[PDB]
Design a protein around this ligand. Structure first.
Ligand code: ZN
Lengths: 288, 251, 1340, 66
DNA sequence: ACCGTCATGATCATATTATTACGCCAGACAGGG
DNA sequence: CCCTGTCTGGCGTCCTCTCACCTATGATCATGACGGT
RNA sequence: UUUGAUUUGGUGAGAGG
């Protein structure tokens, strides 16, 4: 509503302002009193899909597990690696970021002391054991689950993890709601992934691949920023380069899909006939 | 069973079975009498629809009804639904040795103990008090003990403080969402009629004190007392199982 | 000037806006609707006359008989309200109807009937309404609640977005009749037009246009324009109006008059349209490709062959043009089917149609209604004339015809109740216009489309359904009997009518049990706009938008008073000034702001008349004439608030209290509370309980007197005058002579209602509040009710509160209360429980109520009399015997000698077992009232004869005192008349007083008046004789009762529940709380005067739960008590009235331009002392809702008392005796006790009874039951490793019967051990699955 | 998806305590299905020790002694 | 005052029709390019 | 024959507390009150 | 060849958390 409620509660609200306030608050009470049914039915579906899964071994005997990286949406690094790899047992032994060192062994639980020795060495990402990669028939082994979470140690042989997991996902169901180009922020080094590129005539490295990931790696080794750069964008920078904080490093036009080339030469109209294939629309306000 | 009065409040299945038997008797009599084809086709069709209405009512076209327009409840409707046997009597049951009252604060408590009223304590612990009274030798038969606690003499409160002492109880707030909503305490007896609940523990139950109610349950057997002390005690739940964050945070 | 009870305690009033329309009578919806229902109403409608003239005359199955209608009449009820609530009857009135039977002859139904008969007939019993606005159905006072439903008429909704998953919106046009078959026109993604009738199968829409006897040529004449092609010598020229060409790209070069107008490849501009219409171009030239797809309108036939050239609604090709060109046709009529302007929806619809004439359309409609049966032309005509076009089965109301004409832009709002052809064609025209892009759709939640039914209209509809069942019965009987020998009471029977109206008032979804524990709760349950019930939506299905406040609830439906939980916004409460329109919509007052001046005339606007005009906000500043003092003023135009100029306004609101309801206008400082906390405050103010001595609100809104007087708990004076006799039972008013009838001499007697049971087990008392010899005015309180005081409304009590954290005992929301509160007996509420005991009739004989009872001794029977019933006054405990009743013996041991009765003793030797029916415990009390009802024929025992003699004696004394008191008033009238005209000063009292008529006086008005008083006196004599005989008949007779019951004993226990840790108290802003510790007096924080504070709240609930109004209420309450303490100081020192007059005048002026303006110079030195006697416990202050007391006025009133300006006193501690740092806030808050007590929720069970079908414990508290260890608790014990706890929690403690008896033996012997077994309810699951064709087992 | 996955289980009491019981009981009946219990809700239905918590030693013992 | 006639209450099988106004979301089915 | 609207079924939160309200009938032996002799 | 105290069902409406 274009006219706000300029009066607080210490000054008096008049009539219209309180009525607009009642719009805004009746919507919230209706949302909670109807949201609670979906939250409870979500907890029911979750504890009946889980329902069976019991910690029933001590090691499945595998070497597979998901690759825990810190998550980065495009702003500053949102959830650090110490939040994701706290108390989860590594899959293979993490190499120290210098060269080929056995920093941690390959079946160690990562409690707070190990995670601090991970944060000192600025470890990139940890290949850690996940429950979906567990090889145990009819249950989850004790290492592929992780830390007990309300006990400091590993999960005991027996403790029902499906039900506590289903409750822990569905329990915050009440608090949840129901109803141009790239500008860098920090100052570091450039790295490109999924890139197949070419240098244009002016010098800005344009990209012949749609799915290119533009990472900003710091001077230490960890990945601090990530972005998605489209097919055919004007990169102000290049691979492995050092930039300044706030300098624009990418540019494109999303309303005009570029059909840029790899080589040079002359242009011919192959199967382009005016009258059937293409049409003649001379511009009104420009003339070109 | 009859309700309070002189008539029998009959179940719906008796209507269903009585109709199937009425129709089956009619069909046997018509096959005795050699009625023509269309009569016994309607008779067997009414029996088919009667059996199909008995088993799963309303899966066929519009369900039959006795009183008044509401359809009557069949066997499959004794199984299925929110109020069948699974979701209403086998997964969740009503429970003896249990109680319920309004909560209040009582901040003098240590966080392994909760306040529990004397009237609820003498009602929930009637068999332990009976066993204690029969051990001392104050009475003889069970009747005498039930008269003693029906009168509430001066000697059963010492018996009650000697059955409480190291015996945990399960406090439970009514919308239990995660496992920290059932926690086991040790009772401390309360002159009053309200459960005194230690304040830090409230942030686990999502329990404010604006009119809330909680249920108490008594672990009867010995393995259940040990599970209440060793797994479900309130000192043992100081970290939320969803993460690593402490749940006994000062509110 | 002020009324005499307004000179008792005149409430201080802040407030700035001078009112112009006072609060109306708050119960006008119920009373006005039911007065509209039952009243002798001529000119047909509304009322019962509408039903009796729409279902009658019943004419027979061609037997030439007819049962027509004359009139109706309701006799008096046999039972008044008090006897009806005591005994348990309906409060009904018999409905006598005068019906007439006429019987026509042969060969002339337009001929003379041979015989008529007109007579009185009995049908049904409709329950009357009491003066409070409530019904008494079976001794329990019930309220029928107004329903909010959809307005009958057309409704053009748009199924937006969701269908077909391609964004193409649909448009449907639901015609909503008031009674009959629905009708939904709609579209489909192929842009065809589909009708449907009552959500049945779907047909193309034009099949009903053929059913109204339209040929296809006429249909295309209606729904399209025409395009004319003239074959004139060159390329089949065209008549062209260029308005159709607005933006169309032509296929050639349009030239005319030898001039190129339009080029090929371009579109026709608007200026080219101007050129062609300025030069008046008519005939243009088309190519052969232009009429390649033009759709012909009507049929062309060739004159030579007699065949069809081209059918109607067909595109034209080359060969069709070649055929019609050589047949002699020069004019070609086609249609204009554009992309944006006019789609060919009718044309595609007629191309999907298989039907061709009227008969096939009627056959297809008869086949979609009743599937699979042979149609016949007579049956199809009869069905389609009885769907929409008959007075019987289809009826829009006047509301329906108004909406149907208004939403189609008609002029006359009057029409027939049935549809016609023009109506359906206008629906299809408006639907096609909405699809074309002009015009708008209609929203649902807009209150111009939500009608309000009430008690009268719903009772009329249920009575009409009863009448159509009885017209089925009368049509059955009338032409299947011998005539003339019967009368019209042998035909019509009263069973379906009484069954229908008794089922509606008895158990409906809207005839609900009155929440009666408070005058506020009565007067806000009667004003309720429920959306649920029959014809409306349901809670567990819908929805989102209907639970939201629309912009047109402003001043009709309250935005902040609604129950939170599963139905928010469906159980809306109607606002204060909101009336109901003539049709049923909502309307609200406004003030007609003529061009400069706010004129003080009120003017009621509906919900759609409000939108067109522009309404000024309620609190806009104006300078003594009406001229708006600003030049930008905040207004709202069309559902949207904005800022408008000074003199473009058309209406102003009346008073600033009109957005809210009466539940949430007793909240002081409402504009400072966030809306959630105001909602919770209004709902808990409804949930209060009446205390023992209700005090007053120190900080009210002035709305208390409307809620108290305009409800029915106080004893309002009817005619003013002088009080003659006050008593705790009765009050006698002597009526003043300038208010008094000439005859029926008249002094009124108010019989108050002493201690009796309410519905919520409170104690509805009435206390007399007037002195003796005191004048009272017409319209004035005499007896305060429950939670009233001097005619005000005192729900809870006002106590000294401090906001400080005090050692944790008020942690989340808790409240900490001194023992000074419980010592003063000030929350000690009084509850009354009714305990019934019936004497049924079983086998081996009837029961015994006598006190010769087995298995009991002296200690039980000392509290009973010699006939079983407990005394009146015996203070009992929990588990004594109230009524002794013996029969329980069952069949412990089958009688050896079959039925050996006459052998040992008289009847039997106590069967085999005996146990006098002894009751439970948990509650104390004092037996205040015992009722004994006896089914007639049964021997009355000695106590039933004692109650009969008692009530005979009471009614005898009461009617004799009626005669004596009215005779005393009559003799006082005779003395008042004989002051002049033959006065005898000494001779008047020498003779006996009954002869004051034959004294010396001529034929004047005085001897005429003495003759009229002799007529009145002899009428009172014979009336007293016949009424005492009838009252002896009513006491002496039996009562009709249940099948097979001897006598019913009802006993009223009267518990007095005080306060304890665990009760729920709350203020009036949402500050809830369980009281957590009842401290001693010494521990309370006191101040540097000495007084302890009573209640210590918690400050931390204020910044999060944003209810900042309670702190302003606290400061203004402290100001009020400061003025009260200064009055108490100036009066305790025995000071003369001059200083009291000075100080009271200074405390009543004190403000800005306000409304009160009192002066004590016209109170005359005796009322000022009594006004100060009423002000010494504090000075009441009114603070209206949105025009309240600002901060500076509270500061100036805290400066009048010698209190600190900031409101905060420094407070010492009680324990340490040393000062709290940073001085704390004290004041008075008006706090309410709620009836969620703690000795009604607390429950405990070791081992009780067990259910029958599944061997699990019972549920509830009255049934001694156990708490449900539900499913999520089972999940929470699976989530730990607790395995034995869950095994005994669902096998031993709950279900397995041998397991739990082994458990009970093992617990009383000290061996904690369980033998598990199986749940018996799992065996019930096996029997229910096995009772199907399924074979479930248990292997191994 | 979770409701299609909990109704497609090799234990028909687990898939019958949850949503529609008609479909699951006819599928299990005409298949002749058998419920080797082996989970939490089968043992909450049938009234014995949970095979997760303290009862995991009891179910180790019973699974060893077959 | 006894005998006969009208009236009125027990027990007992007989077996189903004249409203509409949720919102997705899978899952199965006749239609047609 | 592979997309496709269209129709039919199947979900929709736990725990607790208070109150009221509960099918019609169509046919007959035998008891029960009323009037004549 | 003689020992026993035992059982209060659906439907719909409303409130608390
Ligand atoms: Zn594993």
């Amino acid at each position: 509503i274009e006219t706000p409620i300029t009066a607080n509660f210490r000054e008096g609200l008049n009539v219209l302002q309180y009525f607009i306030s009642t719009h805004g608050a009746r919507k919230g009470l209706a949302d909670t009193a109807l949201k609670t049914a979906n939250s409870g039915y979500l907890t029911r579906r979750l504890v009946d899909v889980a329902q069976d899964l019991v910690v029933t071994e001590d090691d499945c005997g595998t070497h597979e597990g998901i690759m825990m990286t810190p998550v980065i949406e495009g702003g500053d690094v949102k959830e650090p690696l110490r939040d994701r790899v706290l108390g989860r047992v590594t899959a293979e032994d993490v190499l120290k970021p210098g060269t080929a060192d056995i920093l941690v062994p390959r079946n160690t639980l990562l409690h707070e002391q190990w995670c601090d020795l991970l944060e000192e060495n600025s470890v990139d990402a940890v290949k850690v054991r996940s429950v979906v990669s567990c090889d145990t028939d009819f249950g989850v082994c004790a290492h592929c689950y992780g830390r007990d979470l309300a006990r400091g140690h590993i999960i005991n042989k027996g403790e029902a993890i499906g039900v506590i997991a289903a409750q822990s996902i569905g329990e915050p169901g009440t608090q949840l709601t129901m109803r141009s180009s790239i500008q860098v922020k920090n100052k570091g080094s450039i790295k490109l992934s999924n890139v197949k590129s070419v240098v244009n005539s002016s010098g800005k490295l344009v990209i012949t691949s749609r799915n290119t990931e533009l990472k900003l790696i710091d001077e230490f080794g960890r990945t601090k920023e990530s972005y998605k750069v489209p097919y055919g964008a004007v990169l102000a920078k290049g691979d492995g380069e050092q930039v300044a904080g706030g300098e624009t490093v990418a540019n494109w036009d999303p309303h005009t899909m570029p059909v840029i080339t790899e080589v040079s030469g002359f242009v011919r109209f192959t199967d382009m006939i005016d009258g059937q294939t293409i049409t003649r629309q001379t511009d009104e306000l420009t003339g070109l | 069973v009859p309700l309070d009065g002189g008539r029998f409040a009959t179940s719906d299945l008796n209507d269903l079975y009585r109709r199937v038997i009425n129709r089956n008797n009619r069909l046997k009599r018509l096959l005795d009498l050699a009625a023509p084809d269309i009569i016994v086709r309607n008779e067997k069709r009414m029996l088919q629809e009667a059996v199909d209405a008995l088993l799963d009512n309303g899966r066929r076209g519009r369900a039959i009804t006795g009183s008044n327009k509401r359809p009557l409840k069949s066997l499959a409707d004794m199984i299925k639904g929110k109020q069948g046997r699974f979701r209403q009597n086998l997964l969740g049951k009503r429970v003896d040795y249990s109680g319920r009252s309004v909560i209040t604060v009582g901040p003098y408590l240590r966080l392994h103990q909760c306040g529990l009223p004397k009237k609820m304590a003498l009602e929930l612990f009637k068999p332990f008090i009976y066993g204690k009274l029969e051990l001392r030798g104050l009475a003889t038969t069970i009747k005498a003990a039930k008269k003693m606690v029906e009168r509430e003499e001066a000697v059963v409160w010492d018996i009650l403080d000697e059955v409480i002492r190291e015996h945990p109880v399960l406090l439970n707030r009514a919308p239990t969402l995660h496992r920290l909503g059932i926690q086991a305490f040790e009772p401390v007896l309360i002159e009053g009629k309200a459960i005194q609940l230690h304040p830090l523990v409230c942030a686990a139950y999502n329990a404010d004190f604006d009119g809330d109610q909680m249920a108490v349950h008594v672990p009867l057997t010995l393995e259940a007392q040990l599970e209440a002390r060793a797994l479900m005690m309130s000192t043992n739940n100081i970290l939320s199982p969803a993460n690593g964050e402490p749940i006994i945070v000062p509110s | 000037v002020y009324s005499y009870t307004e000179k008792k305690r005149i409430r201080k009033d802040f407030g700035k806006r001078p009112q112009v329309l006072d609060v109306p009578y708050l119960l006008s919806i119920q009373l006005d609707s039911f007065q509209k229902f039952i009243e002798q109403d001529p000119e047909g409608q509304y009322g019962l006359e509408a039903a009796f003239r729409s279902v009658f005359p019943i004419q027979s199955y061609s037997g030439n008989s007819e049962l027509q209608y004359v009139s109706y009449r309701l006799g008096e009820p046999v039972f008044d309200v008090q006897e009806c609530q005591i005994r348990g009857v309906t409060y009904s009135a018999p409905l006598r109807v005068k019906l007439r039977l006429v019987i026509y002859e042969r060969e002339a139904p337009e001929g003379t009937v041979k015989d008529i008969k007109e007579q009185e007939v009995y049908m049904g019993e409709i329950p009357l309404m009491t003066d409070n606005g409530t019904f008494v159905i079976n001794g329990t006072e019930r309220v029928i609640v107004s329903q909010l439903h959809r307005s009958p008429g057309v409704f053009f909704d748009s199924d937006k977005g969701k269908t077909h998953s391609s964004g193409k919106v649909l448009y449907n046009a639901r015609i909503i009749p008031y009674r009959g078959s629905w009708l939904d026109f709609e579209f489909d993604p192929k842009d065809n037009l589909f009708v449907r009738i009552d959500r049945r199968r779907k047909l193309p829409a034009t099949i009903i246009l053929r059913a109204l006897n339209y040929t296809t040529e006429q249909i295309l004449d209606l729904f399209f324009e025409k395009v004319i092609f003239e074959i004139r010598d060159n390329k089949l020229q065209m008549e062209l109006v260029p308005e159709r060409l607005r933006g169309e790209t032509a296929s050639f070069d349009i030239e005319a008059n030898g001039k190129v107008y339009v080029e090929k490849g371009r579109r026709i501009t608007a200026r080219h349209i101007r050129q062609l219409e300025k030069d008046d171009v008519k005939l243009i030239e088309v190519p052969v490709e232009y009429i390649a797809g033009k759709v012909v309108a009507k049929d062309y036939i060739d004159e030579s062959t007699g065949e069809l050239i081209c059918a109607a609604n067909m595109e034209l090709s080359l060969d069709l043009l070649a055929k019609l060109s050589q047949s002699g046709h020069k004019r070609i009529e086609t249609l204009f089917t554009n992309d944006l302007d006019h789609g060919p929806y009718i044309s595609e619809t007629l191309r999907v149609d298989p039907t061709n004439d009227r008969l096939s359309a009627l056959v297809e409609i008869y086949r979609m209604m009743r599937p699979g049966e042979p149609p016949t032309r007579e049956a199809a005509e009869s069905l389609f004339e009885n769907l929409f076009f008959s007075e019987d089965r289809y009826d829009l109301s006047a509301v329906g015809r108004m909406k149907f004409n208004r939403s189609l832009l008609r002029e006359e709002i009057e029409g027939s109740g049935i549809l016609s052809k023009d109506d359906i064609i206008d629906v299809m025209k408006k639907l096609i216009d909405i699809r074309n892009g002009k015009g708008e759709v209609d929203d649902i939640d807009h209150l111009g489309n939500r009608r309000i039914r009430s008690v009268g209209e719903m009772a009329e509809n249920q009575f009409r359904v009863g009448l159509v069942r009885v017209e089925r019965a009368v049509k059955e009987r009338l032409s299947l009997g011998d005539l003339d020998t019967l009368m019209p009471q042998d035909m019509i029977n009263a069973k379906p009518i009484s069954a229908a109206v008794k089922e509606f008032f008895g158990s409906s979804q809207l005839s609900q049990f009155m929440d009666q524990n408070n005058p506020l709760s009565e007067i806000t349950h009667k004003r309720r706009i429920s959306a649920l019930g029959p014809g409306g939506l349901t809670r567990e299905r819908a929805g989102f938008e209907v639970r939201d406040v629309h912009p047109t609830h402003y001043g009709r439906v309250c935005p902040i008073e609604t129950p939170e939980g599963p139905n928010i916004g469906l159980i809306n409460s109607l606002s204060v000034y909101a009336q109901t329109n003539e049709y049923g919509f909502l309307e609200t007052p406004y003030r007609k702001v003529t061009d400069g001046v706010v004129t003080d005339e009120i003017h009621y606007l509906s919900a759609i008349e409000e939108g067109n005009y522009v309404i000024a906000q309620a609190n806009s500043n104006l300078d003594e004439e009406g001229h708006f003092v600003e030049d930008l003023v905040t207004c709202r135009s069309k559902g949207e608030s904005s800022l408008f100029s000074r003199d473009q306004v058309d209406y102003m609101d009346v008073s600033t209290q009109q957005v809210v309801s009466v539940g949430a206008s007793l909240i002081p400082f409402l504009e400072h509370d966030d809306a959630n906390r105001a909602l919770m405050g209004a709902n808990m103010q409804r949930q209060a309980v009446p205390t023992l001595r209700a005090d007053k609100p120190l900080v009210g809104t002035g709305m208390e007197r409307a809620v108290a007087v305009d409800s029915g708990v106080t004893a309002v004076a009817k005619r003013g005058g002088v009080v003659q006799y006050v008593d705790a039972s009765r009050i006698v008013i002597k009526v003043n002579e300038d208010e008094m009838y000439p005859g029926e001499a008249g002094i009124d007697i108010y019989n108050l209602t002493k201690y009796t049971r309410s519905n919520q087990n409170t104690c509805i008392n009435q206390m007399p509040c007037v002195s003796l010899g005191e004048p009272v005015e017409r319209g004035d309180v005499l007896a305060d009710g429950p939670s009233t005081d001097l005619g005000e409304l005192a729900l809870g009590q006002n106590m000294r509160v401090a906001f400080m954290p005090w050692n944790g005992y008020n942690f989340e929301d808790s409240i900490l209360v001194s023992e000074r509160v419980v010592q003063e007996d000030r929350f000690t509420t009084i509850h009354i429980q009714e305990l019934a005991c019936v004497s049924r009739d079983t086998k081996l004989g009837p029961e015994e109520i006598t006190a010769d009872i087995p298995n009991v001794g002296e200690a039980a029977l000392s509290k009973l009399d010699e006939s079983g019933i407990v005394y009146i006054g015996a203070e009992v405990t929990g588990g004594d015997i109230l009524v002794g009743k013996v029969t329980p013996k069952g069949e412990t041991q089958l009688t050896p000698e079959e039925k050996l009765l006459r052998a040992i003793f008289g009847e039997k030797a106590s069967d085999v077992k005996d146990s006098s029916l002894r009751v439970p415990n948990g509650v104390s009390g004092t037996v205040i009232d015992v009722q004994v009802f006896t089914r007639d024929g049964v021997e009355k025992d000695k106590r039933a004869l004692e109650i009969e003699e008692m009530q005979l004696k009471q009614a005898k004394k009461d009617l004799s005192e009626e005669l004596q008191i009215l005779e005393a008033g009559l003799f006082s009238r005779i003395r008042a008349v004989l002051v002049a005209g033959g006065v005898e000063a000494e001779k008047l009292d020498k003779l006996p007083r009954d002869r004051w008529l034959e004294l010396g006086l001529t034929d004047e008005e005085k001897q005429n008046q003495l003759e009229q008083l002799a007529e009145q006196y002899d009428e009172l004599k014979h009336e007293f004789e016949k009424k005492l005989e009838a009252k002896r008949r009513k006491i002496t007779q039996g009562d009709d009762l249940a099948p097979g019951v001897l006598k019913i004993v009802k006993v009223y226990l009267a518990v007095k529940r005080r306060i304890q840790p665990g009760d729920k108290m709350a203020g009036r802003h949402g500050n809830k709380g369980v009281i957590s510790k009842i401290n001693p007096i010494e521990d309370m924080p006191y101040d540097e005067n000495g007084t302890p504070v009573d209640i210590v709240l918690n400050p931390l609930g204020v910044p999060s739960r944003m209810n900042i109004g309670q702190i302003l209420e606290t400061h203004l309450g402290m100001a009020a008590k400061g003025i009260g303490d200064k009055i108490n100081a100036m009066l305790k020192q025995q000071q003369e009235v001059a200083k009291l007059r000075e100080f009271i005048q200074r405390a009543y002026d004190l403000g800005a331009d306000v409304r009160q303006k009192v002066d004590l110079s016209t109170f005359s030195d005796e009322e000022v002392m009594r006004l100060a006697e009423n002000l010494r416990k504090g000075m009441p202050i009114a603070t209206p809702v949105f025009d309240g007391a600002k901060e500076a006025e509270i500061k100036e009133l805290l400066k009048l008392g010698d209190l600190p300006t900031s409101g905060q006193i420094r407070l010492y501690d009680g324990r340490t005796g040393e000062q709290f740092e940073r001085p704390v806030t004290v004041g008075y808050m008006y706090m309410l006790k709620l009836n969620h007590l703690v000795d009604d929720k607390m429950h405990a069970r070791s081992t009780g009874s067990y259910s029958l079908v599944t061997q699990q414990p019972l549920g509830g508290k009255a049934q001694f039951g156990g708490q449900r260890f539900g499913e999520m608790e089972v999940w929470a014990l699976e989530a730990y490793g607790a395995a034995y706890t869950l095994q005994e929690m669902l096998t031993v403690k709950s279900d397995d019967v041998n397991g739990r008896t082994k458990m009970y033996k093992n617990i009383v012997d000290g061996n904690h051990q369980m033998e598990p077994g199986m749940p018996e309810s799992f065996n019930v699951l096996l029997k229910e699955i096995r009772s199907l064709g399924i074979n479930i087992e248990l292997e191994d | 998806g979770i409701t299609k996955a909990s109704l497609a289980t090799e234990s028909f009491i687990s898939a019958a305590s949850f949503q529609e019981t008609t479909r699951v009981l006819t599928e299990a009946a005409v298949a002749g299905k058998r419920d080797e219990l082996r989970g939490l809700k089968e043992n909450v239905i049938v009234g014995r020790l949970i095979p997760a918590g303290t009862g995991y030693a009891y179910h180790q013992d019973r699974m060893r002694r077959r």
